Amino acid sequence: NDKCKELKKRYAGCEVRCDXPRYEVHC
Secondary structure: OOOOHHHHOOOOOOEEEEEOOEEEEEO
16 A cells, blocks of 8 residues: 555645554645
8 A cells, every 4th residue: 555655745745644544634
């Protein structure tokens, strides 16, 4: 699963922290 890699990477211009099952993203 490449989805931390690439949420961390469309939200490049925003805030986004992935930690295993946790998906943080402020965009």
